[PDB]
Design a protein around this ligand. Structure first.
Ligand code: MG
Ligand code: MG
Ligand code: MG
Ligand code: MG
Ligand code: MG
Ligand code: MG
Ligand code: MG
Ligand code: MG
Ligand code: MG
Ligand code: MG
Ligand code: MG
Ligand code: MG
Ligand code: MG
Ligand code: MG
Ligand code: MG
Ligand code: MG
Ligand code: MG
Ligand code: MG
Ligand code: MG
Ligand code: MG
Ligand code: ZN
Lengths: 129, 224, 88
RNA sequence: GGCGUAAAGCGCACGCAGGCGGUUUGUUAAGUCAGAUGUGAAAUCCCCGGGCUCAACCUGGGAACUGCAUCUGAUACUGGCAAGCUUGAGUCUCGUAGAGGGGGGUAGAAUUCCAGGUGUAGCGGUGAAAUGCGUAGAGAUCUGGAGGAAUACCGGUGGCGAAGGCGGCCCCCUGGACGAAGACUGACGCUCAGGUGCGAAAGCGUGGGGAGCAAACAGGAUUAGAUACCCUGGUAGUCCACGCCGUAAACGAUGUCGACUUGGAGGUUGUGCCCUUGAGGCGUGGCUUCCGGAGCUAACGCGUUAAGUCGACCGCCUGGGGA
């Protein structure tokens, strides 16, 4: 069944991106919306919207550069079968800092960089480069 | 060339739905009668943009290789090509004309030796078999290499009638960084083409239009 | 399967009305009825294994509904099984 | 790190424990995160110094002991609790296709047998033969009857089922699948060690049944031999009932469930629309066959029915022989 909708989100991005799709859409959720926010703010997607009230559909506008996908890799780290948590001084960095790790903290979802600078650790949701 | 101007020739006609290559979704208006109809809104600006870069290339003494070996259009590509002081390949493309040019170049030398000898050297004193036997060789070389005989080096651009039919030539170009301008019909793969011109690549009326246009802009680019 | 008259009748008996056709109580009554009818079928047709796998599905399925109900409203559950004369 | 062809998917399904679990709010603050405090013996290791002629060695100070515990906070994610939500999952209605299962009837073709008519010297079998059968009249032909077993044509990369497997026709009992429309329940879900059930053929036990076929066995041949291949016979068995067995190259050699990712030609089966005005025209579900794109792959190949891109849970592999 559909027991990890975040992996599903990652994957819908990854596959539509690989399929040079202009956009991708998925059932929404606050947690997805919090991740989409980080992606956009770090320039991995154009923009996003959620539409509807009772059955909210979230939509991500993908991004391309040299007839290439801006998103090179996008992988699930922590997951329902194996939760991954890190401390502030243990926070991974992707591509030596060129990519990012999405981290969920007591102060909401942010990048490894952000959480690092704010003295926090959290659940490592994914890597993106 | 004009949207109105193109439509008459039937540039808009394409192959059947069943034979399409999906990559060409953007450039298809839609389909009627189980035949794909290309978008002339997309064709002209892209075609004009092809002519501009050709015009630029021609204005720095660039050499243009016209390629179109369809039997139906073989002659039209020649006259089109000669009308602008350039070079052509109008019968079966020999694989490695560009990538193995050093070897194929030898055949060019052979060509010239043969027509030169048969005229200025004249012979006409033969053995009676050599008249036809040497003409045989000369006849063959002419179709194969008549159009590039004086090309001297590698071309600076290729203009191609039918990207699928001429996939070999477009692939050699790709390897040598030579830019490819091509009429790319709904059934073909536009990936090998730097400037994709999407329209019919069969009908002699349509073929002559692009080609007639191509040869004309070379002269403008030449005339400076 | 159950007849449309016999199905409609149980929905009346255990539902909030005629259209409360998917309530847990109703679903479990309908399964009950069909299980007990089929008790007759397999008495005579012991070798009908294929059909039995279908009966066994009605059973395992009724079991899951009864557990959900028990979890969500034990009072609704006790009534339902006593009323259907189940559990022994 | 692996399980199509190399070692590796349990033959198949149901399902307890367990693992995992859609979406909103509030709450909690165990997991997780932060800080503070205590503790984490010394030696050892490491860093910078000091002392023995150097080095080993000895030694000062540091750093490290990545750990544990208490307190105080943070509340995004996971867990608990409470109320929900409707898209997952069910229920309801009306229809459709099907060798899906079980029971009971019944049909026409053929073989063998029994009883006769006609007829007369062969039939049968093989590479060639012989064993065998026929003047107690075979074989051939026509007629009537008995019995068992299987259902030509239809029939088809057709259909149904979890797998094994299911085919004449009719009825009865019964399981599943799919479509259309809307109503209802409200995460009731996915997976499953152990457990339970199913499970070709052969084989086993009791009693039936016995046409054809045929292990064993006998006879005739072949052959250097021929415990075979071929021929003439032929018992178990193959069939029925009720029990047992629990295995197959039980195979797609590919576990189940869900989400996502270009196309072409067909087969099959629902359903909405169109002068039904033609055996059609435009859509929309389920299953299926052949190609093929990216991607994957050692290659072969797979390729929206994945062997692609991901997640949840299970089973299994760890060189050959021994086994
Ligand atoms: Mg390995
Ligand atoms: Mg194979
Ligand atoms: Mg193997
Ligand atoms: Mg299997
Ligand atoms: Mg609070
Ligand atoms: Mg010293
Ligand atoms: Mg020391
Ligand atoms: Mg010290
Ligand atoms: Mg110490
Ligand atoms: Mg919560
Ligand atoms: Mg008979
Ligand atoms: Mg039925
Ligand atoms: Mg409600
Ligand atoms: Mg027996
Ligand atoms: Mg025999
Ligand atoms: Mg026996
Ligand atoms: Mg086995
Ligand atoms: Mg294929
Ligand atoms: Mg390929
Ligand atoms: Mg070994
Ligand atoms: Zn063409």
């Amino acid at each position: 069944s559909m027991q990890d909708p975040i992996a599903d989100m990652l994957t819908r991005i990854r596959n539509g991106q690989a399929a040079n799709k202009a956009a991708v859409t998925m059932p929404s959720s606050k947690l997805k919306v919090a991740i989409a926010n980080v992606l956009k703010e770090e320039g991995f997607i154009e923009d996003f919207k959620v539409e509807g009230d009772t059955k909210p559909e979230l939509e991500l506008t993908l991004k391309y550069f040299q007839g290439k996908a801006v998103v090179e890799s996008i992988q699930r780290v922590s997951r329902p079968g194996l939760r991954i948590y890190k401390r502030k001084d243990e926070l991974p960095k992707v591509m030596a800092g060129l990519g990012i790790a999405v981290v969920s903290t007591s102060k909401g979802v942010m990048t490894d960089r952000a959480a690092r600078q704010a003295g926090l650790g959290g659940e490592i949701i994914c890597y993106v480069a | 060339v004009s949207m109105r101007d193109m439509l008459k020739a039937g540039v808009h006609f394409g192959h059947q739905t069943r034979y399409w290559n999906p990559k060409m979704k953007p450039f298809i208006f839609g389909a009627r009668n189980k035949v794909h109809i290309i978008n002339l809104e997309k064709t002209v600006p892209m075609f004009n943009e092809a002519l501009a870069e050709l015009n630029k290339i021609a204005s720095r003494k660039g050499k243009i290789l016209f390629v179109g070996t369809k039997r139906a259009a073989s002659e039209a590509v020649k006259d089109a090509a000669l009308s602008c002081d350039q070079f052509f390949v109008n019968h079966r493309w020999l694989g490695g004309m560009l990538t193995n040019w050093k070897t194929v170049r030898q055949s060019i030398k052979r060509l010239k030796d043969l027509e030169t000898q048969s005229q200025d050297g004249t012979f006409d004193k033969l053995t009676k078999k050599e008249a036809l036997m040497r003409t045989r060789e000369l006849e063959k070389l002419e179709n194969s290499l008549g159009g590039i005989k004086d090309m001297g080096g590698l071309p600076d651009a290729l203009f191609v009638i039918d990207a699928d039919h001429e996939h070999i030539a477009i692939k050699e170009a790709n390897n040598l960084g030579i830019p490819v301008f091509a009429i790319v019909d709904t059934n073909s793969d536009p990936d090998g083409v730097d400037f994709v011109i999407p329209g019919n690549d069969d009908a002699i009326r349509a073929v002559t239009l692009y080609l007639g246009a191509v040869a004309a802009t070379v002269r403008e680019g030449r005339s400076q | 399967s159950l007849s449309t008259e016999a199905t409609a009748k149980i929905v009346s008996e255990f539902g909030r009305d005629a259209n409360d056709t998917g309530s847990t109580e109703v679903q479990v009554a309908l399964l009950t009825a069909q299980i007990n009818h089929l008790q007759g079928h397999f008495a005579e047709h012991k070798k009908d294994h294929h059909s039995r796998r279908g009966l066994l599905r009605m059973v395992s399925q009724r079991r899951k509904l009864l557990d959900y109900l028990k979890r969500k409203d034990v009072a609704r559950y006790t009534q339902l099984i006593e009323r259907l004369g189940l559990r022994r």
